[PDB]
Scaffold this active site. Structure first.
Site, PDB file in Angstrom:
ATOM      1  N   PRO A   1      37.654  42.761  43.392  1.00 33.15           N
ATOM      2  CG  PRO A   1      39.709  42.041  42.206  1.00 33.15           C
ATOM      3  CD  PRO A   1      39.523  42.760  43.783  1.00 33.15           C
TER       4      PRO A   1
ATOM      5  CG  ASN B   1      32.104  33.584  31.727  1.00 24.15           C
ATOM      6  OD1 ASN B   1      32.782  32.677  30.511  1.00 24.15           O
ATOM      7  ND2 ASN B   1      30.596  33.254  32.051  1.00 24.15           N
TER       8      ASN B   1
ATOM      9  CE  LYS C   1      42.428  45.776  40.833  1.00 23.62           C
ATOM     10  NZ  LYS C   1      41.378  47.077  40.721  1.00 23.62           N
TER      11      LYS C   1
END
Lengths: 117, 118, 114
Positions: free
Chosen positions: C1, C97, C32
Site C-alpha cells: 500500500p 481518496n 499487509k
C-alpha cells in the site's frame, strides 16, 4: 471536490486571490458547496510538457459525481482559462485528470461519505 | 501521457537531461507522440518504503489506452531501469501506479480528448 | 500500500516518528506486511479547504484490495485520528481518496504484481 495544480511557474507568479478564485469558481461549476471545495497549488516544479520546460501544468479534479463528457469540457474551459489568465500558461500545455470518486472511496471527518450501510 | 516521479533523492542527484530522457523513452514505449508526453520529477521528498528512508520512488503513469498487463510489465522494467541507473534507486523500492484514462476524463487545451459527441 | 498526505502544516510541526507510525499503523490496518508499506508526507503546501487556509490535509491511500465501505471508514478514523493528534488538523478538514488498485496496474521490482 479536490483540485490540484502542479506547475513549473514560480511561486512569485501566483497572484493574490488565486486559491479563492479556484474555490469559488469550482463550487459554482460543480454545484457543490464552497465549504467542501479543496484546492492545492504546487509551484516551482521540475516538469516538462512535450520535452519543453516552458510554462505548463498538470492537474487533477476529484469529485463525487458531476464528472462526465460535457461537464468535464466545461471544467476544462474554466480551468485552462484561469491558468492562462492568472499563471500565463498556454491551454495546450495543461493536462487535467478527472476522477469520478465513489462516496465510499472518499474519507472525511473520521469516516467516509458512505454513511448509508 | 503523464509520468510523475516522487522521490527522496536530492535534486542535485537528478541528472541534467533526465526529463528529456523520460520523455523520449516514454514516447517510444507507449507509441504516443513526444509532444504529448508530460513528465514531472519531485525530489527531496519526505518518504519511507518498508519503514526505511533509503532511496525510493512513488510514481504514476497516466495514459489514454496503452495500459495493460503485458504493457505495464514492460513499462515497469523500463522505468525501474531508468530510476536505478539515473537516480540510484533500487527496483524493489519503487512503486508505479498505472492509470488507463478515458478520453472524456482528460482535459487539455480548453476541452477534453472527447471531441466526438455532445 | 502507499499513503500520501499533502498538508499546509509547516515541516517543523511534523513530529519525530510520524513516518514510522504511519507505516506501522497502516500495516496493521490493511493487514499487509510493513515492508510493503510506502508513506509520503508533504508539508508546507499552498492549499485551502472551504476557502480557508487553516490547517488541512489532502491524502490518498492506494492498495491492491483491502479497499471498501467498512474498511475505508476504519482507515479514515485511524488516519484522521493521527492527523489530528500529530499535526493538529481537524478531521473535517481532511480528504482521503481511496484507490483499489488492480495488481496488473501496480509496478514494482521491474515487473508488476500480476
Amino acid at each position: 471536490p479536490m483540485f490540484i495544480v502542479n506547475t513549473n511557474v514560480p511561486r512569485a507568479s501566483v497572484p493574490d486571490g488565486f486559491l479563492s478564485e479556484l474555490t469559488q469558481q469550482l463550487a459554482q461549476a460543480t454545484g457543490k458547496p464552497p465549504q467542501y471545495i479543496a484546492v492545492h497549488v504546487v509551484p516551482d516544479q521540475l516538469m516538462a510538457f512535450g520535452g519543453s520546460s516552458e510554462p505548463c501544468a498538470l492537474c487533477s479534479l476529484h469529485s463525487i459525481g458531476k464528472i462526465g463528457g460535457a461537464q468535464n469540457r466545461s471544467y476544462s474551459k474554466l480551468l485552462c482559462g484561469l491558468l492562462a489568465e492568472r499563471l500565463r500558461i498556454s491551454p495546450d500545455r495543461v493536462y487535467i485528470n478527472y476522477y469520478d470518486m465513489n462516496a465510499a472511496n472518499v474519507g472525511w471527518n473520521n469516516s467516509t461519505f458512505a454513511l448509508e450501510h
